[PDB]
């Protein structure tokens, strides 16, 4: 069960440097519709541990973009 956390660390770390606004929009709207978020004065903060199992598979997928061709 120590693997789960890892899935959060890597994502977290990557997200911290991630700039692809194309994804930040997808993810945000994802955890946003859920409600597991807390917006402050002027910023968007969220915890990776607040992700749902079924939502985690969708979270990691976004970053794992690709190209069908």
């Amino acid at each position: 069960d120590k693997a789960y956390l890892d899935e959060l660390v890597e994502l977290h770390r990557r997200l911290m440097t991630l700039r692809e606004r194309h994804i930040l929009q997808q993810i945000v709207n994802l955890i946003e519709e859920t409600g597991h978020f807390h917006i402050t004065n002027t910023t968007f903060d969220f915890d990776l541990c607040s992700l749902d199992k079924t939502t985690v598979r969708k979270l990691q997928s976004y970053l794992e973009t690709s190209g069908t061709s």
């Binding site: 959060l8 997200l15 930040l24 910023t43 968007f44 903060d45 969220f46 541990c49």
Partner: peptide, 25 residues
């Protein structure tokens, strides 16, 4: 630290919550 907070400038994204219907807790 079973928590990983990630802050994203609202300028970099768009939060859909303009004409909200109702909070209700």
């Amino acid at each position: 630290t079973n928590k990983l907070p990630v802050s994203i400038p609202l300028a970099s994204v768009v939060l859909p919550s303009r004409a909200e219907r109702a909070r209700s807790t």
